[PDB]
Amino acid sequence: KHPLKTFYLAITAGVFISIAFVFYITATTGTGTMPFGMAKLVGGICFSLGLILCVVCGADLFTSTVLIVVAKAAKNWLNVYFGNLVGALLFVLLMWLSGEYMTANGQWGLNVLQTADHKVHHTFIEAVCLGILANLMVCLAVWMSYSGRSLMDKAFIMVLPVAMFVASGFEHSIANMFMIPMGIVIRDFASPEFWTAVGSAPENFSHLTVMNFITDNLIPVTIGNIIGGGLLVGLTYWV
Amino acid sequence: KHPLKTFYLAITAGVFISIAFVFYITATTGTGTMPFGMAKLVGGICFSLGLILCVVCGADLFTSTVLIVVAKASGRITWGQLAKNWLNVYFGNLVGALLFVLLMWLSGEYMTANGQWGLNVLQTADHKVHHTFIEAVCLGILANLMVCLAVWMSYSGRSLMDKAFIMVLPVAMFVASGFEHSIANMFMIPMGIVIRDFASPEFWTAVGSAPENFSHLTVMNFITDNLIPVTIGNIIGGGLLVGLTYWV
Amino acid sequence: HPLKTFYLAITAGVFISIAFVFYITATTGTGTMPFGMAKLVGGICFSLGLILCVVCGADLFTSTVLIVVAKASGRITWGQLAKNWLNVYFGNLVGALLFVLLMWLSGEYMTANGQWGLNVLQTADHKVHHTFIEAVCLGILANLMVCLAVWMSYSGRSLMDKAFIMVLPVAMFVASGFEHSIANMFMIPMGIVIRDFASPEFWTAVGSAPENFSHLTVMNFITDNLIPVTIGNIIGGGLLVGLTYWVIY
Amino acid sequence: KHPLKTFYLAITAGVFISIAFVFYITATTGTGTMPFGMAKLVGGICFSLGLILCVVCGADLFTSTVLIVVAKASGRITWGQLAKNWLNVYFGNLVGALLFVLLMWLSGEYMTANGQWGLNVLQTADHKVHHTFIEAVCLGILANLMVCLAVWMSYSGRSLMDKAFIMVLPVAMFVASGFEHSIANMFMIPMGIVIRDFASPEFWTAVGSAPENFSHLTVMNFITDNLIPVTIGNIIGGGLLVGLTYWVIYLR
Amino acid sequence: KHPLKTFYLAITAGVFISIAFVFYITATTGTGTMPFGMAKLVGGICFSLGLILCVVCGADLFTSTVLIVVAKASGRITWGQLAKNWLNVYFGNLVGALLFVLLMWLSGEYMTANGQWGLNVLQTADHKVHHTFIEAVCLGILANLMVCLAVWMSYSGRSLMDKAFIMVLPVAMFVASGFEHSIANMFMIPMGIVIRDFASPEFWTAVGSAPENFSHLTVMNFITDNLIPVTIGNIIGGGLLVGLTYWVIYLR
Numbered sequence A: 001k002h003p004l005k006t007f008y009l010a011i012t013a014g015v016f017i018s019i020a021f022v023f024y025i026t027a028t029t030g031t032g033t034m035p036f037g038m039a040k041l042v043g044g045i046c047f048s049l050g051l052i053l054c055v056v057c058g059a060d061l062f063t064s065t066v067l068i069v070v071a072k073a074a075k076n077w078l079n080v081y082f083g084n085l086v087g088a089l090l091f092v093l094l095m096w097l098s099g100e101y102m103t104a105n106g107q108w109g110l111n112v113l114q115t116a117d118h119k120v121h122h123t124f125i126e127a128v129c130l131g132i133l134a135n136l137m138v139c140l141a142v143w144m145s146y147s148g149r150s151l152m153d154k155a156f157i158m159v160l161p162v163a164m165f166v167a168s169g170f171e172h173s174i175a176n177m178f179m180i181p182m183g184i185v186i187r188d189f190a191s192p193e194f195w196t197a198v199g200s201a202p203e204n205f206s207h208l209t210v211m212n213f214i215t216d217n218l219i220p221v222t223i224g225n226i227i228g229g230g231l232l233v234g235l236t237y238w239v
Numbered sequence B: 001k002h003p004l005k006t007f008y009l010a011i012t013a014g015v016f017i018s019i020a021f022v023f024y025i026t027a028t029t030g031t032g033t034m035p036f037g038m039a040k041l042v043g044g045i046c047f048s049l050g051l052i053l054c055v056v057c058g059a060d061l062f063t064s065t066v067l068i069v070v071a072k073a074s075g076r077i078t079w080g081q082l083a084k085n086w087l088n089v090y091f092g093n094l095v096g097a098l099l100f101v102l103l104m105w106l107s108g109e110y111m112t113a114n115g116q117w118g119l120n121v122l123q124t125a126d127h128k129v130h131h132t133f134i135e136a137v138c139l140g141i142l143a144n145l146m147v148c149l150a151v152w153m154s155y156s157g158r159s160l161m162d163k164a165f166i167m168v169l170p171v172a173m174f175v176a177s178g179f180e181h182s183i184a185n186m187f188m189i190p191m192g193i194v195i196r197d198f199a200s201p202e203f204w205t206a207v208g209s210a211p212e213n214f215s216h217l218t219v220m221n222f223i224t225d226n227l228i229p230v231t232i233g234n235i236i237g238g239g240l241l242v243g244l245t246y247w248v
Numbered sequence C: 001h002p003l004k005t006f007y008l009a010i011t012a013g014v015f016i017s018i019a020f021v022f023y024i025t026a027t028t029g030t031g032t033m034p035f036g037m038a039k040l041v042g043g044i045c046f047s048l049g050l051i052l053c054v055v056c057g058a059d060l061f062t063s064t065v066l067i068v069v070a071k072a073s074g075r076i077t078w079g080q081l082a083k084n085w086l087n088v089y090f091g092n093l094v095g096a097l098l099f100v101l102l103m104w105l106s107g108e109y110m111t112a113n114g115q116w117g118l119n120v121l122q123t124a125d126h127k128v129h130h131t132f133i134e135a136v137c138l139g140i141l142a143n144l145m146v147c148l149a150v151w152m153s154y155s156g157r158s159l160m161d162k163a164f165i166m167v168l169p170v171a172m173f174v175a176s177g178f179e180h181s182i183a184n185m186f187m188i189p190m191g192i193v194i195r196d197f198a199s200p201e202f203w204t205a206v207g208s209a210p211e212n213f214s215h216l217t218v219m220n221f222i223t224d225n226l227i228p229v230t231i232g233n234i235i236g237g238g239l240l241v242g243l244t245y246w247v248i249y
Numbered sequence D, E: 001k002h003p004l005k006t007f008y009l010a011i012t013a014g015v016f017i018s019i020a021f022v023f024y025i026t027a028t029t030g031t032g033t034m035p036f037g038m039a040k041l042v043g044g045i046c047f048s049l050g051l052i053l054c055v056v057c058g059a060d061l062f063t064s065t066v067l068i069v070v071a072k073a074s075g076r077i078t079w080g081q082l083a084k085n086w087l088n089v090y091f092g093n094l095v096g097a098l099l100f101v102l103l104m105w106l107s108g109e110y111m112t113a114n115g116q117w118g119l120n121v122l123q124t125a126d127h128k129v130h131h132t133f134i135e136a137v138c139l140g141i142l143a144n145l146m147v148c149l150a151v152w153m154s155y156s157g158r159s160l161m162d163k164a165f166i167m168v169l170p171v172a173m174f175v176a177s178g179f180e181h182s183i184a185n186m187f188m189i190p191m192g193i194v195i196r197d198f199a200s201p202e203f204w205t206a207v208g209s210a211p212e213n214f215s216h217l218t219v220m221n222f223i224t225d226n227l228i229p230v231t232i233g234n235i236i237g238g239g240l241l242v243g244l245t246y247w248v249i250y251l252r
C-alpha cells in the first residue's frame, strides 16, 4: 500500500526486465548466420524470464497487470513508470561495470548496439503500433498467468506470449529503458579495443543519443503501450 | 449467450489467431536453408499461442468448441440450433483478423529482416490461393479436425498447463502440414494482398521481387479460391467429429 | 459394446494416421540433417497419435492389453482377451484407409516440391523389404513400447501426466524404425496410392519414376509387412502380459 | 520379498536399460557432423527413458534405489540388508540385457541408416573397453552417483510428471559425459561383440570397415576391462551416497 | 542446525555444483562453430541441474537460501544471524568441489573428444582469471542475484516440477552470460589448474597447445583475481536482495 513499497517493487520490476533483455542479448550473440526467426524465437523464450520474475516475485511492471486490476472491481503509474526507469538504469550501470560488452570478442556489445539502434529508426506511428502490439502480449500473458494455480502454470503460460512479442521486435517501453541506454553507454564509452574487435566506430551509430531515445522511441512506444493496454481494458468492460 | 458479447469474443478470437499467424511468420522468417519440416514444425508450435489464447481467455473461434457444445448439452440439440452464433462468430472473427491486418501493416513489420518477413507473408498467402476446390475443402476438413480435437482435449484438463500444452502438438500438426483454417486465412491472405498492393519500392528491391509475381493475390481470388472451399471443408471436418461423438 | 468399439477403432486408425502424417511433415526435407536427430523429432511428433488415442478414449489394437489384465486382477483368460481384437483391428484399418483417401484428395503429396510425397514412398518402401523374421522382431519392439507407454499413461493423474509420459517411449520406437501394424495400415497404402496415382509433375519434381518403387503393392504390403508385423505386435503384447501375470500372482 | 519376483523385475529393468541405450544409439546415429556435446546431450536425454521406465513401472535396476531403501528404514539398516538382493538383481539385469541384445540382432537394426546404426554401436562399445582400470572405476562411481541421485529425486515427486521429468537432467548428464553404468554396458558391449562377430559382408562394405578394426571387442575384454571395474565403481558411488545418507539422518 | 550436518550438506552442494559445471563442459564441448549464444544457453540449461540438486536434496550452497532465511523470520533477524554459518558452508562447499576435481581427474575425462573436453576446461578457467577486480565483483553480484532469485521462486513451488523447472531460466541466464559464482569456480578453476599441471604430452598434442599458454592458471591467481572479488560480489548480490526484502516486508 505504501507508495514507497510500490516504488521499490517497480525498481525491482525494472531490474527484472533488464535481466530479461540481458538474457535475450546473450542468447542471440553470434547468431547472424542462423535463420532470423529461429534465433529471435530463442531470444524471446529467454526474455520471458523477466515477466516470470515479475509475476512470481510480486514486482510492479508498468501497466502489466491492468487487466487484473479491472477484473477485481490511478496515477500510481507515474510512480511505477519512474521506479521502472530507475531499476533499468541501475542495471545499465551494473552491466557496464561488469565488462560484459566485450563478451564473445565484443559481439555481445555489438548485438546491444544494433538492437538499440534498430529501435530508434521507426516512424512515430509504427513505433506507437509496435508499442500497442507489445503491451497487448504482455497484458494477455499476465492475465493468463493469473488463472494459473501452480508455479508451473503461472510461469510457463507466459513463455509463448512473451517470446512472440520479443521475437517479432514489438516495442516495450520499460524493456527499452534498459536496451537503448545500454546502447548509448556502449557507444559513448567503448574502448578502442572494442571498436577494433567489432569492425566499427561510434559514428556508425550516430542516432544512438539520449534525445533520439526519448523522442523517437520512448514517447511513441509508451503511448502505444498505454493504448494497447487500454484496448484490452475496454474489451474487458463490454464483457 | 448475449449476441453482442460473443461478437466481441469472436472479434477477440480473430485477433488471437492473427497473433498466431504473425508468430508463425516471425519464427519461420529466413528459414530458407533449414529443412522444410523442421521450420514448419517450429512455426506450428508457435502458432499454438493463438488457440491457447482463445481457450484460456474464453474467446470464440468459429466452430472450435462444437464438440464441447454437444457433450455439455448431454446430447440435446439439432442442426438449426448448433449454428445460431455461427455467422455471428464468423463475421466477428473476420473483423478481428482485418483489424489486426491494419495494425500489422501500420507497424511497418513487413520490412523486418530486410523485408524477409514481408516476403514470407507474400509466399504463404500466395500458396493458399493455388488449390483445387476439392483439395481446399480437404485441407479445410483436415485443419478443423485438428482444431476441434485440440479443443476437446483441452477441456479435459484441470490445470493451466493441462489446458494449454495438450493443444500444442495437434495445432502444430495442422499448421506444419499446411492444412487450411478459414479464419487464420482471414489474416494471412488479406495480409499478403495488402503488402502486395501497398509495399514500398524499397521493399521490392530489398527482397528482389515484384508485385506482378503475386498476380493471384486478389481479394476476389481470396474469397472464391480459398475462403469458400476452406470454410466448407472446415465445416465438414467439424461435421464428422460431431456425428462420431454423438453415438456415445 | 461391439458397435461402440468398432467406431472407437475407426477413431484410433484416424489418430494413428494423423501421427504418421505429422511424422512425414516433420521429417520432410531432412536429408542433410543427422539421421537420428531428424527421426527423433519425427517420433516426438508421432506421439500425438497415442496421446489422441488415450485422451479421447479411442481403441488402438492391443495397446491397452496391460490395463485390462490389471483391471481383471489376474482373474482373466487369454481366450477372452481377443474376442474384439478382430473388431478393433478391422476398425483401425477402416480409419487408416479413410485417412489415406483424405490425404490423397488434399494433394498434400506435392508439398515441398514433391518431397513430402517422396518421404512417404521411401518410408513405405523401406517397410516392405524386411525378412519375415526381421519384421516380426521389429513388431515385437514397437508394441513393447506402445504397451509400456499406455501402461505408464494410466498411472497418470493429470492431462500432463497421461500425455507426456508417452512421448519418449513412442518417439523411441518411431525414431528407431520399429514396426506397428496399425500405423502401417496408413503408411504403406498411402505409398501405394501415391505411386500408382502421382502425376507426371510429381515424378519430375521428385526426380524418380514409379519403377523405382516396384515392391510397393497391396500384396507385398500384406505378406511382407502386415502379417509378420501383426504377429510381432501380438507377441510383444503377450510377453508383457505374461510378465505382468507372474508379478501379480 | 520372494527371490523369483525380484528376478523377473530385474530382467525387466535390464530390458528397460537396453531400451534406453537403443534410443541413445538411434538418436546419435549420423551425428558425426554435429557438435560433440550437443549430440551427446540429446542422446542422454533420450536415454533417461530407461530410468523413467524402471521407476514408473517398478522394475529393479542394480543399486538404483539404495538411498530410498536407507531412507524408508530411517537408516536403521545394515549393509548386509542393503546388498541382500544385489547378486540376484545384477544377474536378472544381465539376463534382460542379453535377451534384448538377441531381439535387437534379430530385428536387423544394425543395418539402419546404411549400417551407421550398427557402426555407432561398434564405436560406442569399443570406446568402453579402452579405459585403464582406475579410469573405469572412477567413471563407474560417477555414473551411479547420477543414477542414485536421479532416483532419489524421483521419490520426492507427487505426480507422474514429477517422478519422470526430474530424472532427465541427471541421467542425460551421466550419459552425455560418457560415465559408465554396468547394466547399461551389459547391453551395449555385448551388442558390439555380436555385431562384430555376425555382421554381413554388406554391413562392413556399407560402413567402410572390417571386424579386424574392432578386435578388442571380445567377451573377456568386456568382462575384465569394463564390467569388473565399472561394477566396482558403481557400488562405490552408491556406497558413498549411502554413507552420506546415514550421517545426515543420524545428525538428529 | 547441527554444525557437522551442515558441513556434510555443504560438501554435498559443492559436489552438486561441480556436477553442474561438468555437465556444462560436456554439453559445450566441440561447440566452437555454433552461434556463441546458443551453445552457452544450452550449457546454461544443463548447468541448472546443480541448483536443482541442491534445492531438491536440501544441500547447503553458500548464501543461495539467504532470502528464504529472511522470509522465515518475517524479516525480524539481523545481518550477523544471516552469515552465522557462511564460513562453515563456504569451506564445506570448497571441500566438495576439490573432491570432485580429484574424481574428474582420475576419471580421465579431460581426454574426452580428443582432449577437447580438457581444452574446454582450460579456456573456461583461464577466462575467469582475466577480469579486473571491479569486473569480477560485478560479475559476482550478477551471478548471485540470479541464484538467490531462482531459489526464492523455487520456494513458492508446491510440486517437484515447480521447484525444479522454475529455476532453469534464471540459472541458464547467469551461466550462459558468463556471470561469476564463487562455489562453481571452486570446481572450474582448480580443474583447469590441475589439467594444466598434470596433462600428458598426448593431451597437449591432440589439443595443439601447451601449459605456457595458460600461465595465469595458478592457485594464487585463482584466489586473488577471481575468488576474492567474485565472493565479495556474490555477497553484495545477496545483500542487495535481502535489503530489498526487508523493506518490502517492513511496508506491509
Ligand SMILES: OC[C@H]1O[C@H](O[C@H]2[C@H](O)[C@@H](O)[C@H](OCCC3CCCCC3)O[C@@H]2CO)[C@H](O)[C@@H](O)[C@@H]1O
Pocket: D080, D083, D084, D085, D086, D087, D088, D090, D231
Ligand atoms: O554368504 C551367504 C549370504 O547370502 C546373502 O548375502 C549375499 C547377498 O544375498 C548377495 O546379494 C550379495 O551379493 C554380493 C554383491 C554382488 C553385486 C553384483 C556383483 C556380484 C556380487 O552377497 C551377499 C553375501 O553372499 C545373505 O543375505 C547373507 O546373510 C548370507 O551370509
